[PDB]
C-alpha cells in the first residue's frame, strides 16, 4: 500500500498523464525539488504524505476560460461561509491579511463585498462541496483555488475536514493557506522553490510568507 499511494499522488497532481513509474517519479522529484533519483525512495514518500494544495502541479483541473489573469484592479471578494474553528472576526482578518500580502506588490486592490458577484468567492466545504473537485477528508490536501475569470474561476475553497488555526499549536494556518490559495486566484501556478509561498506543500512559517519567486511571478502578470 505504498505503490498505490504513489500511483494516486502522481495521477491527481498531473505527473502521470504528462509521463515504469520511474519517469513520472522523476517529473515529481524535479517539480518538488527533491533528489531526482527516479525511485520511490523514502524522501519522495515523505513528500507524498505531506499536506498540500489540491491544485495540480502539471496541467490544470480543466480547460479554463480566458487568459487566466484579471483585467481590472479593484478585485472584490466574498466570504461565503465560515469554519467553526475560529471566530468570524479572526477569519475575516486572516483573509484580509492574506490579500494584503498581494496588494503590497501589485496594482490590485481587495475590497470585501456581500454578493455572489464578487470576483473571488471564499468558501469552506467538505468532500463534495459544489465544484467537481471533492476534498479528501482530514489531512491530505488542505484547499484549492481556480485561475482568474468568470463564475467558478478566481474562487478559493478550504477543506473544512481540517482543523483551522492561526499560529502554532495544532491545525493548519488559515492565513498561510489562504495566502497561497489567493496566489492561485490571481494567476500564479505552483512554484518549485521549497521556501516560496506558491510551493505546493504546507510549511508553517512566521515572518514573511512571500519569497522572491512569488513577487517575481506575480509581476510578469500585473
Amino acid at each position, epitope marked *: 500500500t505504498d505503490r498505490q499511494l504513489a500511483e494516486e499522488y502522481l495521477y491527481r497532481y498531473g505527473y502521470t498523464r504528462v509521463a515504469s513509474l520511474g519517469p513520472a517519479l522523476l517529473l515529481l522529484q524535479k517539480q518538488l525539488s527533491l533528489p531526482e533519483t527516479g525511485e520511490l525512495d523514502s524522501a519522495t514518500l515523505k513528500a507524498m504524505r505531506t499536506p498540500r494544495c489540491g491544485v495540480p502541479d502539471l496541467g490544470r483541473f480543466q480547460t*479554463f476560460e480566458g487568459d487566466l489573469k484579471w483585467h481590472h484592479h479593484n478585485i472584490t471578494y466574498w466570504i461565503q461561509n465560515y469554519s467553526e474553528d475560529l471566530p468570524r472576526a479572526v477569519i475575516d482578518d486572516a483573509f484580509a491579511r492574506a490579500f494584503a500580502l498581494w496588494s503590497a506588490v501589485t496594482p490590485l486592490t481587495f475590497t470585501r463585498v456581500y454578493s455572489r458577484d464578487a470576483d473571488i468567492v471564499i468558501q469552506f466545504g467538505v468532500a463534495e462541496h459544489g*465544484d467537481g473537485y471533492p476534498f479528501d477528508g482530514k489531512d491530505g490536501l488542505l484547499a484549492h483555488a481556480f485561475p482568474p475569470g468568470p463564475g467558478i474561476q478566481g474562487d478559493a475553497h478550504f477543506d473544512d475536514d481540517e482543523l483551522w488555526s492561526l499560529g502554532k499549536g495544532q491545525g493548519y494556518s488559515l492565513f498561510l493557506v489562504a495566502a497561497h490559495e489567493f496566489g492561485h486566484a490571481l494567476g500564479l501556478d505552483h512554484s518549485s522553490v521549497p521556501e516560496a509561498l506558491m510551493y505546493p506543500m504546507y510549511r508553517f512559517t512566521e515572518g514573511p510568507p512571500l519569497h522572491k519567486d512569488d513577487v517575481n511571478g506575480i509581476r510578469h502578470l500585473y
Partner: antibody
Amino acid sequence: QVQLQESGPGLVKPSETLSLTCTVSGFSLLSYGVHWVRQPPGKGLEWLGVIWTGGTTNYNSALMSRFTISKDDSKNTVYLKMNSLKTEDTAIYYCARYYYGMDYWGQGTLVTVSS
Amino acid sequence: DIQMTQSPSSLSASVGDRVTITCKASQDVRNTVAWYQQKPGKAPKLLIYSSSYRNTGVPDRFSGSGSGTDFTLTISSLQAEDVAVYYCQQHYITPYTFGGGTKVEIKR
C-alpha cells in the same frame, strides 16, 4: 446576456430514449455548472442531475441510472439522455445555470411519454 | 436524501400583509438554501440565495433568514404581482432536493 434553451422532441414512446439539448450563450460551461430540473405539469420541481465544469456528473438516484449528462464546452451545449422512459417521466425539463443558486433557467420544454 | 418540508402548502393574504413561508430540512444543511419564485407558464426565478442574500433585481420586501435546519422566506408587504409558487432548495449534499412549494394567492 446569459441565456439557456432546451430543444428536443416533445413526444417520445414508452421504453424508448429521450435526448434534450441545452444550448447555452452568454457564459462558459468551463466556468459554471449546469443542472437539469424537471416538473410534471401542475406539480413541483424535482432535481435530476448536474454536470460540473470539469466534466464529472452526479445524478438523482431516484432515476435508476437511466439518465446521463454530457456536454461540449466548445459548442456551448449540454446533453440529457434518459432511456427506458416511463409514463412518470412526462414533465417539463429545465436546464439551469448554477452559481450559489440556479440564477438563469431555460424556458423549459415539455416531454410527453406516450404511445 | 435530505427532505425539505415547506409550510404552508398554500396561503391567501391581502396586499400589504406580511407573509411568512418556512422550509424545514431533515438534517443540517448549513446556509446553502435558496428560494425560487415561479409564475405560471414560466421558469423559476432565483429570489434568495445562501439563506439570506437577495438576488439582483429583487425588491426589498423579499427577505430570507435561517440556518441549519429551519429557514424562513418573508414578504414584508405582499403585492398583487407576487402571486406565484415559492420553492426552497438545499445545495449542501446531492441530491439537491426541493421543497414541495407554497402557493401564494391574494385576497381582494
